[PDB]
Amino acid sequence: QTREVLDPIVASLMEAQQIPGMAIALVRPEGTTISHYGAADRETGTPVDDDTLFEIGSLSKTLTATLASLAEVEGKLDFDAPVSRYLPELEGSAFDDISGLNLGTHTGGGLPLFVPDEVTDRASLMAWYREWQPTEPIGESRTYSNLGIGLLGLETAASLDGEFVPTMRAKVLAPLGMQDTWYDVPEARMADYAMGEDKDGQPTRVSPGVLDDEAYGIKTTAADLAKLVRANLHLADVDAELQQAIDATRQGHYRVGDMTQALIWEQYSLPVAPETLRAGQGYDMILEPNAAEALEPPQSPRDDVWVNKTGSTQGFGGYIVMLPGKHTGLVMLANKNYPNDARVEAAYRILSGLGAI
Ligand SMILES: [Ca+2]
Ligand SMILES: [Ca+2]
Ligand SMILES: [Ca+2]
Ligand SMILES: [Ca+2]
Ligand SMILES: [Cl-]
Ligand SMILES: [Cs+]
Structure with a gap:
């Protein structure tokens, strides 16, 4: 079926990249197909199945964006x-001039990629934010940032008068059925938690850190992420406000060369060449x-675009693609951090083989 297109492409991918295990969700009108391949943990050979949890790294930022958008809708x-209007402890800092939208689009005056070493907790984080000097014109320059999306998370939580994780669960995960x-x-679920494999073939698992929940900390299944994608594609039953919030995450806010930056989601007009997609996932876009x-x-959210987001940790590699015009989406989770170029190629070949591009 669909599996005759999908299975050979993922077998070849897993062999070429030495990926121990994958979970893939294909979302279409007429339904969602979940497929599991290989081992959740190379050392034990426990198979990937419906219960296997994968670290999704920066794909977590799509949830942070969605909660932010719901607070906005409400x-x-x-x-x-x-x-600073929602975090008054930052009054008088650069965050008098930087908005939540800036933070959701990485246009927050060059806010850096990583949480600095000297930041070890909420207090030292807020002290760091208060002292930090913008290095780029606010709203005119994009620097991919964990500090930025992390602060959007803090801002959102404060605006909703709740703690980030329980609030995320009650307002987004639960209504989406992402249990x-x-x-x-x-x-009780550690036996289902896949083990990552790093670029050297070594076991690894993400460590806690400041802003982890907000920026990179989710562990989940392909099926759960498929619910988020289904909602983005207007295929789910969700209340008006959450649907509105989700749709707003796909509003284009900045043109960045060939890429359009939405709320965390990144998109490209169709037809899109794989090279353009590759250039979106490399040094020039991510690290400059x-x-x-x-x-x-x-x-307005478009119907003639390729919408995507990558997510990685040291041992895991994830990718989501959505084609709103075709009402189809693809979630690919792996317990290996394998190259973004290969994620793009596999996604493209799958979607092309299914006739969606
Ligand atoms: Ca306003
Ligand atoms: Ca199990
Ligand atoms: Ca945390
Ligand atoms: Ca190739
Ligand atoms: Cl970080
Ligand atoms: Cs849960």
């Missing part, structure tokens, strides 16, 4: 307001500041 968060999605894997032009004709 009228509790103004996306263009200074972040196998964890920030902290309980002891890129000029960003605000779309203030604020772009």
